[PDB]
Design a binder for this molecule. Structure first.
Ligand code: W2X
Ligand code: FE2
Length: 329
């Protein structure tokens, strides 16, 4: 069998308050988890994940093929050249099982300075018709802000963990310009399940998505209660237990860059499971021009031989590379 990965449950509630000592004790837990498998579950996070799941299910199960084309990103619909990131990512029956809906910062409106400039990675969200999906847009926008708030708190914990002041990351994570995204992923139950939609790892494990590091600062993930994720450790790939009451947290490769691999971006993959389930990541991205000077918390002078990299540069190049490596989702 595959061994269970160590994924501690960390009560992150102190990170919302003003008890600095208590925050330090949470930071230590984040440090330990980040230095070990690179994953932890944030518990006592304050978000109503059951309602998120319910609203997401109502959306996935009621949206029609017509609407999917009308909301599709450019990869599926040549008419929508502005939709690189935001919109619907279609399944391909008999070939590709997964489908999803991505949205960005609700503040990226037509008048936003980065939208006017047509800066890469900024787009205006697309939404289904309100009469067909009543309350969905409002719910989804509010969810963005709810998970932004959790993520800000988590970023205070990571900053303290690394020996910095608590706003070290969060000062670059701002409502007016964050490049963060929500993805509402549907993994279907299918009978029969098309072999073409199943990948096979070198070790023989059936997969829905191959090994990768995340393109993010951190990733803040809600998943249904169906085990599927695996993390590569020195002991090999290990199973990450499901917990549909908590958020699964890990670092992306921007964190690895900034910390000179002190907090690695864990390599992980998604096992194929024939189950109707949800995977709802929030990718914690900074602003387009955000640059944090790389450092090394294992070195006495804290200096690193990595060059500063703007977040916008990192993101545009990472999203493309991901598609090249593991395919268009
Ligand atoms: C490889 C990853 S981390 C997938 N992410 C992407 O494909 C990038 C989406 C970026 C988005 N379109 C944007 O524009 O921001 C992803 O979301 O995987 C989730 C899953 O497959 O369950 C789960 C997180 C498994 O790792
Ligand atoms: Fe991932």
């Amino acid at each position: 069998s595959v061994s269970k990965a160590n994924v501690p449950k960390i009560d992150v509630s102190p990170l919302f308050g003003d008890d600095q000592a208590a925050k330090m004790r949470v930071a230590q837990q984040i440090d330990a988890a980040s230095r070990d498998t690179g994953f932890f579950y944030a518990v006592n996070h304050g978000i109503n994940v059951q309602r998120l799941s319910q609203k997401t299910k109502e959306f996935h199960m009621s949206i029609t093929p017509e609407e999917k084309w009308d909301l599709a990103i450019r990869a599926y619909n040549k008419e929508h050249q502005d939709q690189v990131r935001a919109g619907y990512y279609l399944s391909i029956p008999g070939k590709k099982a997964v489908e999803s809906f991505c949205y960005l910062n609700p503040n990226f409106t037509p008048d936003h300075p980065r939208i006017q400039a047509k800066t890469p990675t900024h787009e205006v969200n697309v939404w289904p018709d309100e009469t067909k999906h009543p309350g969905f847009q409002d719910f989804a926008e509010q969810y963005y802000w709810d998970v932004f708030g959790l993520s800000s708190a988590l970023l205070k914990g990571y900053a303290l963990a690394l020996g910095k002041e608590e706003n070290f990351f969060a000062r670059h994570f701002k409502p007016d310009d964050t490049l963060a995204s929500v993805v509402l992923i549907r993994y279907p139950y299918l009978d029969p399940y098309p072999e073409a939609a199943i990948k096979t790892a070198a070790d023989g494990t059936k997969l829905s998505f191959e090994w990768h590091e995340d393109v993010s600062l951190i990733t803040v993930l809600y998943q249904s209660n169906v085990q599927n994720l695996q993390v590569e450790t020195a002991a090999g790939y290990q199973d990450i237990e499901a917990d549909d009451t908590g958020y699964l947290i890990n670092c992306g490769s921007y964190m690895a860059h900034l910390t000179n691999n002190y907090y690695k971006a864990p390599i992980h993959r998604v096992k194929w499971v024939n189950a109707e389930r949800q995977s709802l990541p929030f990718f914690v991205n900074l602003g387009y021009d955000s640059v944090i000077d790389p450092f090394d918390p294992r070195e006495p002078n804290g200096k690193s031989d990595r060059e500063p990299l703007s977040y916008g540069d990192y993101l545009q190049n990472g999203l493309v590379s991901l598609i090249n490596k593991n395919g268009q989702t």
